[PDB]
Design a protein around this ligand. Sequence first.
Ligand SMILES: CN(C)c1ccc2c(-c3ccccc3C(=O)O)c3ccc(=[N+](C)C)cc-3oc2c1
Length: 154
Amino acid sequence: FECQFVCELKELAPVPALLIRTQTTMSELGSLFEAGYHDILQLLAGQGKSPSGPPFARYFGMSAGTFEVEFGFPVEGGVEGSGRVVTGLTPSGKAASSLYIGPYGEIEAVYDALMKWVDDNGFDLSGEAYEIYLDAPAETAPDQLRTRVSLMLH
Ligand SMILES: CN(C)c1ccc2c(-c3ccccc3C(=O)O)c3ccc(=[N+](C)C)cc-3oc2c1
């Protein structure tokens, strides 16, 4: 992945979200997200509401076998949670960010590129990663699958 032209620093505006905040492994992540995103969409339907944008996930310590993950959908205000689905916010602050097109299994390429770009520009990372799944992977060709990848800055 080349960062020459498409990598940028973004100022992220926090907006309301419905989230699940839990922990997972890389093996179980796919099943976790299908289950939890389904459930969030059902809780939204459950109030006669829709998401306000594509779903996302936040990650820290992804090397560990088991790592924290927070994932969900941006929503209108006035939405309530239930069970383990909670109201919160999308990230705020600065991030080093790039659009990535391709299968998730090759996304480390953009991570490597962004960490090089961050080093070249003297920025500091918090260690948190933030992915926005602009396309649904079940319904999209892998060579067209869009994810925005952001590394949060310290
Ligand atoms: C852009 N919007 C509208 C969407 C909508 C749905 C998804 C689902 C999903 C939700 C429920 C059931 C199946 C899927 C699927 O498509 O497999 C995603 C599932 C997994 C995922 N990861 C990053 C592993 C990412 C997912 O992103 C999505 C994005």
